[PDB]
Amino acid sequence: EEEKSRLLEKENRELEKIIAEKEERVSELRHQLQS
Amino acid sequence: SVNQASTSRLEGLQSENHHLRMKITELDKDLEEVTMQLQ
């Protein structure tokens, strides 16, 4: 379970990066609504 | 008891993984809805 945890920790970190990227994209799109 | 700790750690990371994946599903929905609003 040690390998699995180490790998899953890295997966979760990557998913957090994906989440930040998607939120920033939604923000970019909302900025485009105004201008 | 470090063995039980490792098992708990994995279960917790699995819970976290699901939380993050559910957030992604929500964000994909937001991306589509705002894209439709903008276009």
Curated annotation (Swiss-Prot), chain A:
Residues 5-33 are annotated as: Interaction with ATF4. It comes from the Eukaryota. It is found in: Cell membrane; Postsynaptic cell membrane; Cell projection, Dendrite. Residues 1-35 form a coiled coil. Highly expressed in brain. Weakly expressed in heart, small intestine and uterus. Isoform 1A: Mainly expressed in granular cell and molecular layer. Isoform 1B: Mainly expressed in Purkinje cells. Isoform 1E: Predominantly expressed in peripheral tissues as kidney, lung, trachea, colon, small intestine, stomach, bone marrow, thymus and mammary gland. It is linked to Neurodevelopmental disorder with language delay and variable cognitive abnormalities: An autosomal dominant disorder characterized by language delay ranging from mild to severe, varying degrees of intellectual disability, and learning difficulties. Additional features include early motor delay, muscular hypotonia, behavioral abnormalities, sleep disorders, and seizures. Component of a heterodimeric G-protein coupled receptor for GABA, formed by GABBR1 and GABBR2. Within the heterodimeric GABA receptor, only GABBR1 seems to bind agonists, while GABBR2 mediates coupling to G proteins. Ligand binding causes a conformation change that triggers signaling via guanine nucleotide-binding proteins (G proteins) and modulates the activity of down-stream effectors, such as adenylate cyclase. Isoform 1E may regulate the formation of functional GABBR1/GABBR2 heterodimers by competing for GABBR2 binding. This could explain the observation that certain small molecule ligands exhibit differential affinity for central versus peripheral sites. Heterodimer of GABBR1 and GABBR2. Homodimers may form, but are inactive. Isoform 1E (without C-terminal intracellular domain) is unable to dimerize via a coiled-coil interaction with GABBR2. Interacts (via C-terminus) with ATF4 (via leucine zipper domain). Interacts with JAKMIP1. Belongs to the G-protein coupled receptor 3 family. GABA-B receptor subfamily. Alpha-helical parts of the C-terminal intracellular region mediate heterodimeric interaction with GABBR2. The linker region between the transmembrane domain 3 (TM3) and the transmembrane domain 4 (TM4) probably plays a role in the specificity for G-protein coupling. This is Gamma-aminobutyric acid type B receptor subunit 1. The gene is GABBR1. The chain holds residues 884 to 918 of 961 of the full protein.
From Swiss-Prot, chain B:
Highly expressed in brain, especially in cerebral cortex, thalamus, hippocampus, frontal, occipital and temporal lobe, occipital pole and cerebellum, followed by corpus callosum, caudate nucleus, spinal cord, amygdala and medulla. Weakly expressed in heart, testis and skeletal muscle. Residues 3-39 form a coiled coil. It is found in: Cell membrane; Postsynaptic cell membrane. The modification Phosphoserine is found at S1. It comes from the Eukaryota. It is linked to Neurodevelopmental disorder with poor language and loss of hand skills: An autosomal dominant disorder characterized by psychomotor developmental stagnation or regression. NDPLHS manifest in the first years of life as loss of purposeful hand movements, loss of language, and intellectual disability. Belongs to the G-protein coupled receptor 3 family. GABA-B receptor subfamily. Alpha-helical parts of the C-terminal intracellular region mediate heterodimeric interaction with GABBR1. Heterodimer of GABBR1 and GABBR2. Homodimers may form, but are inactive. Interacts (via C-terminus) with ATF4 (via leucine zipper domain). Component of a heterodimeric G-protein coupled receptor for GABA, formed by GABBR1 and GABBR2. Within the heterodimeric GABA receptor, only GABBR1 seems to bind agonists, while GABBR2 mediates coupling to G proteins. Ligand binding causes a conformation change that triggers signaling via guanine nucleotide-binding proteins (G proteins) and modulates the activity of down-stream effectors, such as adenylate cyclase. This is Gamma-aminobutyric acid type B receptor subunit 2. The chain holds residues 779 to 817 of 941 of the full protein.
